[PDB]
C-alpha cells in the first residue's frame, strides 16, 4: 500500500550545482516502455 509525503516546492535554484554531460544517443523504445541502444 503506497502513500505520498510532501518533499518540497518546484522552483529553479540560482547557483545550483552544475554537472552532467550531453550525450547524443541512438535509442529504440519497445512496447513495454523500455529504452535500448541501437547499433
Amino acid at each position: 500500500d503506497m502513500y505520498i509525503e510532501r518533499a518540497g516546492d518546484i522552483t529553479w535554484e540560482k547557483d545550483a550545482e552544475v554537472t552532467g554531460n550531453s550525450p547524443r544517443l541512438d535509442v529504440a523504445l519497445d512496447e513495454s516502455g523500455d529504452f535500448s541502444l541501437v547499433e
Binding site: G8, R24, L25
Partner: protein
C-alpha cells in the same frame, strides 16, 4: 489529504521499514508519476485516496485524480534542472545541459545524471520553474553510467 502543488515522495510499507519507490509532481489537483513507480496502483495521502485517471506503459507515465496537466517542453538549447528527491535525502536541484535520445519517431531530451532507482518521477524543470518532464526512464550506456529521457506527457 495534502493536495498542495509541489514534489512528493512515493513510499511503501509492504517491504522492510518504509521504502521510497519513487517521486511525483502534484499540479492543479493531479498527481503525476512514472508507471514503473506505482504500476497503476491506488495511492494514499494522509487519510485520503488517489485513484489513477490515465496511464500508459509505453510512455511510462500515470496521472491520479485527473488528466495529465504538464505540457512545458525543453527548448533544445538551454540548461535545465533536475529537482532530485533521493530516498531518505533532502530535495536538491542539479543543473545540466541535456543530451538527445534519437529515435525512429523523433528526438527526445535526455539528462545524464545518476541517482538511486527510488528517485524515478523527480521533475526536470526549465528556467521558469515549469516541469518539462520526469526523470527515471532511460538506458545504461558503455561504462555503466545512466542516461534518463526527459519524459513528458500530453495535455488534452
Amino acid at each position: 489529504g495534502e493536495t498542495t502543488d509541489g514534489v512528493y515522495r512515493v513510499m511503501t510499507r509492504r517491504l522492510l521499514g518504509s521504502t521510497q519507490v519513487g517521486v511525483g509532481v502534484m499540479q492543479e489537483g493531479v498527481f503525476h508519476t512514472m508507471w514503473h513507480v506505482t504500476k497503476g496502483a491506488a495511492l494514499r495521502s494522509g487519510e485520503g485516496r488517489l485513484d489513477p485517471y490515465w496511464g500508459d506503459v509505453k510512455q511510462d507515465l500515470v496521472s491520479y485524480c485527473g488528466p495529465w496537466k504538464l505540457d512545458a517542453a525543453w527548448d533544445g538549447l538551454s540548461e535545465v534542472q533536475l529537482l532530485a528527491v533521493p530516498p531518505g535525502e533532502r530535495a536538491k536541484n542539479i543543473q545540466t545541459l541535456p543530451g538527445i535520445f534519437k529515435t525512429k519517431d523523433g528526438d527526445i531530451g535526455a539528462v545524464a545524471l545518476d541517482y538511486p532507482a527510488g528517485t524515478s518521477g523527480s521533475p526536470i524543470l526549465d528556467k521558469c520553474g515549469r516541469v518539462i518532464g520526469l526523470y527515471g526512464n532511460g538506458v545504461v550506456i558503455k561504462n555503466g553510467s545512466y542516461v534518463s529521457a526527459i519524459t513528458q506527457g500530453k495535455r488534452e
